[PDB]
Write a protein that binds this ligand. Structure first.
Ligand SMILES: *[C@@H]1O[C@H](CO)[C@@H](O)[C@H](O)[C@H]1NC(C)=O
Ligand SMILES: *[C@@H]1O[C@H](CO)[C@@H](O)[C@H](O)[C@H]1NC(C)=O
Ligand SMILES: N[C@@H](Cn1oc(=O)[nH]c1=O)C(=O)O
Ligand SMILES: N[C@@H](Cn1oc(=O)[nH]c1=O)C(=O)O
Lengths: 765, 765
């Protein structure tokens, strides 16, 4: 039978403390507990005994009634605690009025499911799972610590403070780990944080299980460098031991939980592996009087605590001869010089443990105040202490704590509390410590970024993909969590619509700077500058100068017989046409406008048709003579025919500015001239040429005034070749305007020359 | 205190049945449970009370000993069953040697946690959760049913059989539901399925909770019409009542589980809302001998069942006056003609229950054979029947069940089984029934897709997005779920790499039909024939005919005095040049090959070089005379110079066919004749032409033999412009071959016809 610590009194309060370690994986069925525990074990039993004797000593608390206790060992296992709890309720089948419940959430649940049936209030000090807040299933459960709803929030705040996104989660199998990791997963996923993969493990699992878990964790090593452990202390120690076994000394940052806190017994010997880990610890000041009472204990006199001599021997590895408990396993003997004052480490949850004992005390006081206000003691109205009344009194009680605050329970049975942030750092050489690098209260996280990462090179941000909003490149998912993206650049005509897709611009549009939006690329006109068209305009100007010189010479020598043989009007009509060619070239090269672009048509129609019409009549007259003024009229009508066709093409295609986009980039504006709108006048001009071919062959060479027929027959001859050669370039090209300009002013000069010069040259000579 | 059914015996076996319904949410703390049950309650009580008689009347099983029982009421509740289990184990503080576990997985876990402390084996008949298969924590627990693992697969198979991709998930709060939904989520997300959202709810929740759950379920209604309930019977009934309240009559198809099975009590009164639902039932044939005993039971004689009178009054709504259990709540009085034969339904899991007790019988039989073979009864080494030995002999028991099959426990305490897929249909007019429409066994899902949906217009498949495999389009996930995608059309250039990305083809390439792959586009070239080459080659052929005619006239009249002039050999060189130029095109306008394109450049380089150089020498002699046979010497060398440049341009750029791609759509092939490879021969030719233009202008009009020098005075004067006219066309175009073809023959023609034809002319004259 398991041993039990007793203390007499009028009212007896049960307490479950984990004096011994959890049963090993291969001895769960035997329910055999491992080694004794100091922080979680003997210290808590001593705290309970001393605080109860203090309560008995205090006259102002529970006067004239002495509080007893029955402390049992829970071994941090569900079955052992369940059997001890059955032992608690055995009399109810002096009764236990209340239990200072176990420190594990799963164990607390298992004990509560049994205690609630017999109306036994249970006050926990370390069980912090959210599930215990449900008063429908756990009516007889209270705690002096906050739930894990705030601890998960604190962990999420820590991960979101340091840009950590792609973390990996581990939690111990059990209610505490399960609930905590569920809360963390829920809160983090709503705030952009990410989980590579969530793992679970038992605290008592063998070395092989931890090795496998660490292998799975290293499977994401380059990217998921932060591990979030809603783990217990022994789970974290197992992870550290795995790191030691398979050579890992800084590949991970373990973001611990309340289980780890600042426990020195999870990093003993493995400090090098745990350096840089961040943990969350329930805020609890050191208790002075407990330290004063505890360090003065000796195994010779400490007979109340049945485990104490065993503790002595396991702690100071030695054996105590003059006692039953010798245990020769330990070679040497315990000299009367050992004391607990050396390397003494008070457990973090020592404030809470005492508080949970005061609660059940104060809750018993208040209930005694109401039941029998006058009587100072155990009144006859209190012989069968009622569990329901005691629970009610505990729910509405409030008292000053050991720390110096007020402990009180809300409607959910929980109690207010704040958290502390610790960083396990290497302070000196071969010396490590937990350093307080922040806190967390009522939703407000106030860290200290200087103490942790005393440099600008903090831990590599746990991210899956680098920030890739770098202009052209967009972000595409890969069928996994919306966490790890591949970055793809869209084409040049596409701009980023969102961070997720890239959208093409319009027909004549181009994306702006930073590809945030788009832009209608400006139209391109025929510029007056440039090296090419300046030559064309210079040529046109020279042609105009030649034409004005020609007209001056023609009018000065007006009535001379050497020029008064042919019609003066005919070779003034030709002059008007040759001038109109240059005028058409000049008005062609400009901004294509609703006022400008139809002059192109009139030029290209009349100029290369009307001049040849005036010429053909003269050639025919000279040929057939080898008449009168009537040849003028037949000339004019020959113009009018062409004047029809242009007008014929004017109706179907009105003068407008049409935009063409030969490529997706450049935009051009030109008049609406089409394939049919340039061939028909050119077709007629071909006929004009054809007409004069007839004559030119017939005339050939004829001795006239200055042998005009010798030269006028040749000006046409050099024109038809260029007219034909112009077709291939014009048909396929992007330079229609300049080509038209050069064509017109080319066949132009030719004519103006032999037409007039041969005559007017020698005339002036 | 609660009542309990008793039967005396040497060995006592307890049981936990939900005789009454779960306590309502407003009376859980009092632990008073609701109305009586027929299938899950009284029927199983009578099953135990008669199976024990059947065993006790069989000398072949447990001879000369009697099996008593202590049947307790668990009210389908964890707390009530834990209290009753405390009552069971109170003796160990006649002992209970083992129990028939409760029907609920959570309740089974709770009672196992207490029973394993006292080595009391527990056998379950419906506790199907896969949590209890862990023998580390649940050693003394066995069951005659498979795990939920198999059942979750059965569902996954069902959902993947009917294209159902986007479904909703609901499970009952507890272990059964939670474990089942975890398994289903795992093996569904792994294969192809996507869950819109997973919900949970307690069975004993209020109306408002179920209404809220249904409101959340209709949030995804247009897409996810299928809800997967790893829920309990009463959870499904609550869902149906919610559907009735807010007017849903066929928006959802409920995919139920073992909880639902073919229970008429979950779909009574609410058939309209459940029609079409598909449920999974553990297969167990109805035990025939149970009916012939049960149906003849009467409340007058059945005194050993404390719950029989309550049930009898609850079933036929009336009162039994002649009995203490009057229950004056009802109005009328039961006549002595009411029988259980009317509206009798035996529960699905009756055989299981029976087999469970049989499992305990043989375990208690195989023990007594092994412990004391000689004795027929309770031997001395068996008076304190060992729980450990009972469990050991139980795990290895193989026997025959009431169904006729063989019952045997695996290494984890489970037993094999198969599933029946049932469909709730409207058979007649106002008549609804469950129809067996399939089965599932070890991975084989047999089903009858015609009994359900006797048509092709089944339930609108629970899908999110329509298929995107419409050729060009591809799938884009927005970072929501992996089953709701948009369709993006790829451009005509790229081909679909996978379902989710499409990548561009090679620059010379094109996607094949259906965008499945990319194929090599065929190359184009200037084919023999065609519209323009058929006109171009006519020029070359006519030129060759003219050149042969002219050379015939030249060689015939070589010695005629009328040609005794500037060396006829020099002009013969020119004529050979024209012939070479005419044959240049025939190796130019063809299919590009190394043989053709190592001579094309030679031709263009030399043909307009050597002929023109010989013309230069001839005109040089003519001009300087106003020499001897050395003219060839000063001529020939010039040719070499040009040849040198060609050779200079041949070494740097070897003749090879390279593929030119004006755009992605078109492909051509041509040799490596580049811009730099054309200017240099053209530069030399232009320099030569300009050099001889001076002498051509010097000659002008010189009276020579038959005006020989006159024609070449002006004919050459044309060869400049046409060559010049060739320069732009060759630069900006895609027809660089045919342009060269036309230009080469167009140059010679003139020079040829005006230096070798006037000759033929006067030769004839
Ligand atoms: C990322 O963390 C840094 C501090 O390490 C700080 O800038 C901030 O918390 C995060 N960055 C942004 C842009 O918020
Ligand atoms: C969807 O289900 C049908 C029959 O229910 C069958 O074609 C197949 O299982 C699914 N469709 C495809 C294309 O796989
Ligand atoms: N917070 C834990 C309690 N706890 O876990 C440890 O590892 N130490 C410790 O006190 C729980 O809620 O169970
Ligand atoms: N199979 C369930 C139990 N169960 O719940 C019901 O509603 N019916 C029923 O048999 C389980 O494994 O817990």
């Amino acid at each position: 039978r398991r041993v039990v610590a007793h203390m007499p009194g009028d009212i007896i309060i049960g307490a479950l403390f984990s004096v011994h370690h959890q049963p090993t994986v291969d001895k769960v069925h035997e329910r055999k507990c491992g080694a004794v525990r100091e922080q979680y074990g003997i210290q808590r039993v001593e705290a309970m005994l001393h605080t109860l004797e203090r309560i008995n000593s205090d006259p102002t608390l529970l006067p004239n009634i002495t509080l007893g206790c029955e402390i049992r060992d829970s071994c941090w296992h569900s079955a052992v605690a369940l059997e001890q709890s059955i032992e608690f309720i055995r009399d109810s089948l002096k009764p236990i009025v209340g239990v200072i419940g176990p420190g594990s959430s799963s164990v607390a649940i298992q004990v509560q499911n049994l205690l609630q049936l017999f109306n036994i209030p249970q006050i926990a000090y370390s069980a912090t799972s959210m599930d215990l807040s449900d008063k429908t299933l756990f009516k007889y459960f209270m705690r002096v610590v906050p739930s894990d709803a705030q601890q998960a929030r604190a962990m999420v705040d820590i991960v979101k403070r340091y840009n950590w996104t792609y973390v990996s989660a581990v939690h111990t199998e059990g209610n505490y780990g399960e609930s905590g990791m569920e809360a963390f997963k829920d809160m983090s996923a709503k705030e952009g944080i990410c989980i590579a993969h969530s793992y679970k493990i038992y605290s008592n699992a063998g070395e092989q299980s931890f090795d496998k878990l660490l292998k799975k964790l290293t499977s994401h090593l380059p990217k998921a460098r932060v591990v979030a452990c809603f783990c217990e202390g022994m789970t974290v120690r197992g992870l550290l031991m795995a790191m030691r076994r398979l050579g890992l000394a800084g590949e991970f940052l373990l973001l611990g939980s309340d289980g780890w806190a600042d426990r020195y017994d999870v990093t003993d010997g493995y400090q090098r592996e745990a350096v840089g880990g961040i943990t969350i610890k329930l805020q609890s000041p050191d208790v002075k009087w407990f330290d004063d009472y505890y360090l003065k204990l000796r195994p010779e006199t400490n007979l109340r605590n049945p485990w104490f001599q065993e503790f002595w021997q396991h702690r100071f590895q030695c054996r105590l001869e003059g006692f039953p408990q010798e245990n020769s396993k330990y070679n040497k003997t315990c000299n009367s010089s050992l004391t607990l004052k050396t390397h003494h480490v008070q457990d973090s949850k020592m404030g809470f443990v005492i508080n949970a004992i005061y609660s059940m005390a104060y809750g018993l006081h208040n209930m005694q105040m109401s039941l029998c206000p006058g009587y100072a003691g155990l009144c006859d109205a209190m012989k069968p202490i009622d569990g329901r009344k005691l629970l009610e009194s505990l729910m509405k009680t409030a008292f000053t704590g050991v720390s110096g605050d007020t402990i009180l329970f809300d409607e959910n049975g929980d109690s207010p509390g704040r958290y502390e942030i610790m960083n396990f750092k290497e302070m000196g050489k071969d010396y490590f410590d937990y350093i307080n690098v922040g806190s967390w209260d009522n939703g407000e996280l106030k860290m200290d970024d200087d103490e942790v990462w005393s440099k600008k090179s903090n831990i590599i941000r746990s991210v899956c993909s680098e920030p890739c909003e770098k202009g052209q490149i967009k972000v595409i998912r890969k069928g996994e969590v919306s966490c790890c993206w591949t970055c793809t650049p869209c084409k040049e005509n596409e701009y980023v619509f969102d961070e997720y897709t890239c959208k093409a611009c319009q027909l004549g549009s181009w994306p702006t700077d930073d590809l945030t939006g788009c832009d209608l690329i400006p139209v391109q006109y025929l510029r007056w500058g440039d090296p090419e068209p300046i030559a064309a305009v210079v040529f046109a100007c020279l042609g105009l100068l030649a034409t004005l010189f020609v007209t001056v010479v023609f009018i000065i020598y007006r009535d001379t017989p050497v020029v008064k043989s042919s019609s003066r009007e005919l070779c003034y009509i030709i002059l008007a046409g040759i001038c109109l060619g240059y005028l058409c070239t000049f008005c062609l090269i400009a901004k294509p406008k609703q006022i400008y672009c139809y002059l192109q048509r009139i030029g290209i129609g009349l100029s290369p048709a009307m001049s040849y019409s005036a010429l053909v009549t003269k050639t025919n007259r000279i040929a057939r003579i080898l008449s009168a003024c009537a040849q003028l009229v037949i000339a004019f009508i020959l113009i009018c025919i062409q004047l029809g066709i242009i007008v014929a093409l004017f109706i179907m295609e009105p003068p407008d500015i049409m935009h063409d986009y030969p490529s997706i980039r450049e935009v051009y504006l030109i008049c609406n001239t089409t394939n049919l709108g340039v061939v028909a006048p050119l077709g007629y001009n071909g006929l004009l040429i054809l007409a004069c071919t007839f004559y030119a062959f017939k005339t050939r060479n004829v001795p006239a005034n200055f042998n005009e027929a010798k030269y006028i027959a040749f000006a046409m001859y050099t024109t038809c070749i260029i007219w034909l050669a112009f077709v291939p370039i014009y048909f396929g090209s992007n330079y229609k305007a300049i080509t038209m300009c050069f064509s017109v002013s080319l066949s132009a000069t030719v004519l103006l020359g032999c037409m007039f010069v041969p005559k007017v040259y020698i005339i002036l000579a």
